[PDB]
Design a protein around this nucleic acid. Sequence first.
RNA 1: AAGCCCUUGGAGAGCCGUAACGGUGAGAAGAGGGCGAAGGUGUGAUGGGCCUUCCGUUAGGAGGGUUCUCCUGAUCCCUAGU
Length: 94
Amino acid sequence: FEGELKTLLRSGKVILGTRKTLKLLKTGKVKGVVVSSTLRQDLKDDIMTFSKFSDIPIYLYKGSGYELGTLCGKPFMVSVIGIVDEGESKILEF
RNA sequence: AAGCCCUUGGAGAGCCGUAACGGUGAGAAGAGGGCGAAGGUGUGAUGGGCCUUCCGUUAGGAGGGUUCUCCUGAUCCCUAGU
């Protein structure tokens, strides 16, 4: 799993921050979004509600923003991740 | 004027910011805004109030000015944090 992700950060385009991806996702212009378990529940439904409006695959992450951000490498946590380019990884099928 | 909210915005190997604690990807910075204390300023107030000149000196009568620039300052308030 992590190897697949580590490839995306290497070259594939990524989006960090809910506001941008949530702005973007409603327009149906994202390859995929992965969310850690630590998302505030007020937004989780909206993602799930907006998930079916253009059928964008979503992976649920059991982790928090930290390990997601630790894998992301940013010192601070990331609640969600936005993708507009899979690049060369093999994640989208998930 | 703080605080708290609205868009935009997009930043970390660091940035924002405090008297202090802190805030920051859950959107910081910066731009625009909104709700919005105390107070303050106009008006009320060509009326009185304050001092004062003089003549009248019973009875009263007639004028003058009442500005400007600055400072500290409450245990008297509201406003915030912690």
